[PDB]
Amino acid sequence: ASVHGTTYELLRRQGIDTVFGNPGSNELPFLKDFPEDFRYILALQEACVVGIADGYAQASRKPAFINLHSAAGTGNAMGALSNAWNSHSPLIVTAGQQTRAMIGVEALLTNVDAANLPRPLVKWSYEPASAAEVPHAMSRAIHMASMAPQGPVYLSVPYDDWDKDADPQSHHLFDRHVSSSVRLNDQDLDILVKALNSASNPAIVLGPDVDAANANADCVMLAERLKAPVWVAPSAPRCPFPTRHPCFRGLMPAGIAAISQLLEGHDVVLVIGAPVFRYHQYDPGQYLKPGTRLISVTCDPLEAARAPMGDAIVADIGAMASALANLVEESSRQLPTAAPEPAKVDQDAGRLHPETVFDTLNDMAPENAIYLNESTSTTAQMWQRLNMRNPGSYYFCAAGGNGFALPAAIGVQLAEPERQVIAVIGDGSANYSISALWTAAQYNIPTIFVIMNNGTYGALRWFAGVLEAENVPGLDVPGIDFRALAKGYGVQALKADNLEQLKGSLQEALSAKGPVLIEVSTVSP
Amino acid sequence: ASVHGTTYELLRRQGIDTVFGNPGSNELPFLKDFPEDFRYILALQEACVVGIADGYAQASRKPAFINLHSAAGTGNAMGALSNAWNSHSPLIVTAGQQTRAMIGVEALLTNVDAANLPRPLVKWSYEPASAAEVPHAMSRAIHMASMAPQGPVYLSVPYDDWDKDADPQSHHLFDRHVSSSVRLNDQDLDILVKALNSASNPAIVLGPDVDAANANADCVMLAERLKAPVWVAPSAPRCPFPTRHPCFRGLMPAGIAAISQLLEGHDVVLVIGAPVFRYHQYDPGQYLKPGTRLISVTCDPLEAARAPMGDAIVADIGAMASALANLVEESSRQLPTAAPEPAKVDQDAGRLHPETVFDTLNDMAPENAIYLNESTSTTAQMWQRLNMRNPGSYYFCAAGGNGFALPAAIGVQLAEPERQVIAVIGDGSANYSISALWTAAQYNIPTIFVIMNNGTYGALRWFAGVLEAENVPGLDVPGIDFRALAKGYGVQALKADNLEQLKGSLQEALSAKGPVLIEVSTVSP
Amino acid sequence: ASVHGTTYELLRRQGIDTVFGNPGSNELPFLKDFPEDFRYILALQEACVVGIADGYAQASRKPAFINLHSAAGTGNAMGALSNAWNSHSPLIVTAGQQTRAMIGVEALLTNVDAANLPRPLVKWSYEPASAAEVPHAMSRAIHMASMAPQGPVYLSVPYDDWDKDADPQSHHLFDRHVSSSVRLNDQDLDILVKALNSASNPAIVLGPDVDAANANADCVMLAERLKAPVWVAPSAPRCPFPTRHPCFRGLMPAGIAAISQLLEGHDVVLVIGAPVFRYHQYDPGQYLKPGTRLISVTCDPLEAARAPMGDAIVADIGAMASALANLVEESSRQLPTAAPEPAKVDQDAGRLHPETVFDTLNDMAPENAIYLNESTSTTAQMWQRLNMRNPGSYYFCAAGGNGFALPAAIGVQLAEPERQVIAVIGDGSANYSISALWTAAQYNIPTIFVIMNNGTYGALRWFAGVLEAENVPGLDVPGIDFRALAKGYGVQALKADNLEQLKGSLQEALSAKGPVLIEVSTVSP
Numbered sequence A, B, C: 001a002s003v004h005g006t007t008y009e010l011l012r013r014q015g016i017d018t019v020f021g022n023p024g025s026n027e028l029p030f031l032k033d034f035p036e037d038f039r040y041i042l043a044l045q046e047a048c049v050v051g052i053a054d055g056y057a058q059a060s061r062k063p064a065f066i067n068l069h070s071a072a073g074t075g076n077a078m079g080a081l082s083n084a085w086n087s088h089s090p091l092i093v094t095a096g097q098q099t100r101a102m103i104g105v106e107a108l109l110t111n112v113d114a115a116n117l118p119r120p121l122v123k124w125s126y127e128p129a130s131a132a133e134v135p136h137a138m139s140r141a142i143h144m145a146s147m148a149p150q151g152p153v154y155l156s157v158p159y160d161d162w163d164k165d166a167d168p169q170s171h172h173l174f175d176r177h178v179s180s181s182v183r184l185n186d187q188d189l190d191i192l193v194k195a196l197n198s199a200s201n202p203a204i205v206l207g208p209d210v211d212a213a214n215a216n217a218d219c220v221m222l223a224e225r226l227k228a229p230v231w232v233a234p235s236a237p238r239c240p241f242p243t244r245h246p247c248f249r250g251l252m253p254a255g256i257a258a259i260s261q262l263l264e265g266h267d268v269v270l271v272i273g274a275p276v277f278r279y280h281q282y283d284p285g286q287y288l289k290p291g292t293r294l295i296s297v298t299c300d301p302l303e304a305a306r307a308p309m310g311d312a313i314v315a316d317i318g319a320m321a322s323a324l325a326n327l328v329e330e331s332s333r334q335l336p337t338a339a340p341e342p343a344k345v346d347q348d349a350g351r352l353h354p355e356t357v358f359d360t361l362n363d364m365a366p367e368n369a370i371y372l373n374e375s376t377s378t379t380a381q382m383w384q385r386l387n388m389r390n391p392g393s394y395y396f397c398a399a400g401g402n403g404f405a406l407p408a409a410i411g412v413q414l415a416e417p418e419r420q421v422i423a424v425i426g427d428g429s430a431n432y433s434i435s436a437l438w439t440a441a442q443y444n445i446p447t448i449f450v451i452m453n454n455g456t457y458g459a460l461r462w463f464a465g466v467l468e469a470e471n472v473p474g475l476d477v478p479g480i481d482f483r484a485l486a487k488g489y490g491v492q493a494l495k496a497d498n499l500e501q502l503k504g505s506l507q508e509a510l511s512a513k514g515p516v517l518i519e520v521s522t523v524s525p
């Protein structure tokens, strides 16, 4: 067998059947004779390729396979890898290298010092020392991406390797099963459970790895047993809990003092599947108030090490959530009371308030819709106004890097063909990965893109106000016609200048058979 | 003085007056109170920011200053840095970091292990250990980018540093002058000159660092004195010689055997300002034939070390070209005969052959036009058909990374307001950095963009044919309306489906007062 | 509180009370006002410092704290870190940096790009962005070294940081408890247990992480229940099993084909706490024979990913060994039969055969002796001839790097004051870290050093024979007087030229009150 044949066999035996890519010359020997059981998803720029793959991996809860071109293609994807690192996304990033005989001379298209290029945003990064090693290196990449804590990995392959003979012993790779589905030992788990059972006023904080593990339902059982309020950890990349459940208390503010004040009076705070914590604004004060102690369950040693307070347990979130939910006592305390609905903001017949947009989406969207957020000044309102009952219903750029949601929404829609994806993206953010629209058109992936057009980088105006910074350039983005961009890439487009038009546009989009972009004129901040 | 005030003073004292950027939260404390004598050029995605800055630096022959956001913004620019590394572009890349007090916790927007992120594509990469060090670190960045061999550098700055007090001793930085304008010692230079004077059939090969040094005219004098044919080294990022001068012989083929065959019979081959050599296709054979010896003058130790043959001298290209041109004897040999004009290809009333497009551009464009090339299957024809008399007249992605020419053409046009820039970009390549169009519209930078639309990644079909690779996915890019994309970003747009319309479109574009995009229907390969 | 006071409080609250070091100027602000409850162990060269700390950490099963000087001191320790990486040794390596105000100028003693220096041999490597972050960075280092898979970490601290004010919120660091004591979920653990219970001819292979976890006794119970033979994985850094237990089968040969042949006929091979596998010689063939399947339990994702065959589970070795030992059925198969004693080799009245030395050690040493091995040509005989009943009884350089055993034996003896340590070290290996002898003398740490003096690098002669390599220089090390070296560093020294003198020398050494070196004249290979 060739390295080509052996590697595609390994991939299919490990459950991989899709290549997200933008091709180049070093990759043609890999892509040729493309197997009939695989499918290739082209995107026009590598941030788009990786964003699509990332949404697909996060929603499908399985690794996604990517093929990029050498250093320039890898480099174009590096901002997307920033986000994937902070979402623990299992991404297998492969890139083609020059033929081994010209790597030394640094021929055009040589990826120099290739393994160092995507560092520090990958868990593992490698270029094999010979062609026959390629399948074994691919096996390493698959497992490194997939083991807890999941994350992106990188493999560079000289183009001449694919046609070489494989090692006959590579067959031992095909059916390897690697598990990290582990939980705390019984003795120590009993100590934790007793601490939770004994707490007088526990609180629960959940992060993205809960949703990645599909631990959401177990966390609902845990919160119901403990009679405990539940928040989402700050800067949330995913939604780990039903947002209208009576225990839900919303998105935590991303500040040190704000969080310790919120937790004041809670004796035990159990954090599951989050860093402790993804603060943003500097809001100095106490990490925790006297009387509060914190216990974190995390799948990532790096998160456990860097928490500034609390105890930690490094284990699989699915296994731990299941065990805790099933072991804790039912407390005799009263179940928390559901938060009241948000108020309707006043809305005239002109430009839309973001609150109106989210209320209207909540009214019109299916109950199993999936939302993505890159409308960066409106996140708090989004979290208050969308009832997200089901797992896998929300994604936000985990590193804060714009350019995620537009492509990721396409990947999510590919992963979840029966759940309508609705990406709510600001006019600023829409540009970073605009060409991803083309992939939705070409493959008829029926994502709805809602562009919140207020003419400015609103979240930067917000932060400038926090800093009391004046005379800052570069904050306005006038003069973009998003319907023309959508037409450019073959996507049906609508505009909503007022509420009547927003309702009409959403009704048309929801009954369309392909992707649709709606440009919404929103109020300037 | 604050670090902010001191750093802008250093920048202006070192000749920097423009910030190319896409802002974020960590950068607002740098950008605030933006000085009145500076200008800020916004682009909508970081590949665009860096491409614009790169074109500006290459055309202006001076460093360009960039400001990006943390890891995600830096990462989005990494493919652009691939190209800048191989063009020796003097780019000062700055990125904002989180406040020092939350770097440890890895708050949102922390750039983890920041200096390793852009490696291996930068000459120098650093995050200062204290606020007061920032001006001194900026000084290092300026000089590292600017000294031979020029190239990109990276500086990460915690956002809280800018308001801190500067070191009063930072004033010693402001007027430092650093020179690398050096040439081989007299004794050894005399030996080289005697070898050139003695040669029976010398040849000259020129690379991009000739054009970067503005050594072009000196190289013309040298070639005229030596009566020697002149080629351009393969995979050429710039044009180092007048393309209708009698000595000019065109772009070398990017293959080992092809080059040694071309040089056969030349006893001494003098390479100036090029790697030896940027081959692409694998074309194995002799590096040089018996009877040919090679001497390379390069500004880059890495190029001198990796050449597989020849002697080398590491020195400034401007200083060496001037010295050689003025020291060599005038040979009594006959001056080489100019190459004949290319033939007109047959052209019917339908889709355009690329050769027709280039002939028409050559007929209609001003004599001091500047061209950029990202029409990757048509490079050889472009080189044959455009008379480029002047320095600074051609740019092509030096690492082969698509996404350079569209933004770079804007930067070049900014650098050269009196020379009409015409970027010839394939339909595939146009997408990588499409949002750069917006910057041309907003700042009214009157670049002309000629989109060669053949529906496919033609150069990849070419390489697949070289490999005899079949059943490759992802090679076609149907369904893009470039006039709608241009309208999306505010750029006037025209379409040319035939030669009559191409002439009309070019006449309109050349008399327009702002940027113009022309979508040209070209023949499918 | 100062950073100094806060950091020593963190250290003592996390169980650290000893600093292994070689001081320098950048470290004096850390070491000053040294707390009375700590002790400082000086060694004369940094390979020695780290080797001592490594033996201490491995034997004490807890992290060891090291302080080295800047880049040169860190660099001198890098070979020792090679070994520590492959033994999963929890080492907290700190090094002093220049004052922040001169880092930029690169004053003498600046550690440039410090965090990259010990890479790739550390799990985590960092220099804090401010003085107030130092305690939090130290907390990260402690936990990163200590969490599974344990390993070395690196922290660089500018010397001016220690006297700065600490953050009052650093107290939350002091009592953090971080656990990685995890095991496979119940459902999947039951599947594994059923597979073991069902096996017709199981085999067990154990590696060093068993001994690190003190899982040895659980592995004895497991082997007795399963009625299974037990080997030690190749290139063994530790001894995980009693070597005279009836199930024990010895050290595996370090070759692919040799291992698959050894395992032939075993239907299920359970590997615990080892890489799969640390082969040495290239012995190509089948990784496993038909009929054998492999299951690995490893604490290290990197080991699970790179195994070329088998299933894997990533979990804590102590927790998994305990669970398996207690859950499996007692098989009705007959218990394996103990291996017979090794034969006595013929020995005349002259130079000693290594087999004689090991037999004599086994006869004379206490039953709870601890051995170290850096007599590299005699490892197989050592493993056959020493009855090691107890955990923590054997150490060998895990990366194969000479210079470990001499210092490590001192650290082990410090960790285990009531168990006599006997380091068996070749004449070649003894030189790498010879100055470590001084630390044994100064602190009266009563290690016995047995120098096997055959005049040559015997293991290299062995490998040269495997390669059929001739005319190799540098293999002989004549002319070293080890008694004079021992006298140089204050250690009592004896010589044994024959068996009578070996017995007499060992009797004297075993009844000495301090360290003793015995130079043994062994047969030349």
Ligand SMILES: Cc1ncc(Cn2c(C)c(CCOP(=O)(O)OP(=O)(O)O)sc2=O)c(N)n1
Binding pocket: A079, A374, A375, A376, A377, A378, A400, A401, A402, A403, A425, A426, A427, A428, A429, A430, A432, A454, A456, A457, A458, A459, A460, B022, B023, B024, B025, B069, B072, B073, B076
């Ligand atoms: C890759 C990248 N570049 C720049 C930024 C900075 N950035 C920018 C540019 C934001 C503004 C986005 O504007 P929008 O129109 O999408 O939404 P709002 O107007 O609601 O903020 S939010 C933010 O953090 C970033 N985080 N990531």
Ligand SMILES: Cc1ncc(Cn2c(C)c(CCOP(=O)(O)OP(=O)(O)O)sc2=O)c(N)n1
Binding pocket: A022, A023, A024, A025, A069, A072, A073, A076, B079, B374, B375, B376, B377, B378, B400, B401, B402, B403, B425, B426, B427, B428, B429, B430, B432, B454, B456, B457, B458, B459, B460
């Ligand atoms: C960043 C990046 N991604 C992908 C490629 C691979 N690539 C691609 C995708 C080419 C085709 C460009 O198509 P075009 O329409 O711009 O021009 P032609 O049809 O004339 O080739 S040429 C080439 O090397 C690359 N070099 N750089």
Ligand SMILES: Cc1ncc(Cn2c(C)c(CCOP(=O)(O)OP(=O)(O)O)sc2=O)c(N)n1
Binding pocket: C079, C374, C375, C376, C377, C378, C400, C401, C402, C403, C425, C426, C427, C428, C429, C430, C432, C454, C456, C457, C458, C459, C460
């Ligand atoms: C730091 C280091 N340097 C060199 C070696 C090479 N080396 C050397 C030099 C060996 C010979 C050791 O000789 P010895 O006298 O200690 O024992 P033997 O004569 O029994 O081999 S074994 C071995 O791998 C190494 N592994 N590590």
Ligand SMILES: [Ca+2]
Binding pocket: A036, A037, A038
């Ligand atoms: Ca098919």
Ligand SMILES: [Ca+2]
Binding pocket: A426, A427, A428, A452, A453, A454, A455, A456, A457, A458
């Ligand atoms: Ca906006």
Ligand SMILES: [Ca+2]
Binding pocket: B036, B037, B038
């Ligand atoms: Ca002005």
Ligand SMILES: [Ca+2]
Binding pocket: B426, B427, B428, B452, B453, B454, B455, B456, B457, B458
């Ligand atoms: Ca094309």
Ligand SMILES: [Ca+2]
Binding pocket: C036, C037, C038
């Ligand atoms: Ca004391």
Ligand SMILES: [Ca+2]
Binding pocket: C426, C427, C428, C452, C453, C454, C455, C456, C457, C458
């Ligand atoms: Ca020896």
Ligand code: NA
Binding pocket: A116, A117, A118, A119, A120, B116, B117, B118, B119, B120
């Ligand atoms: Na990098």
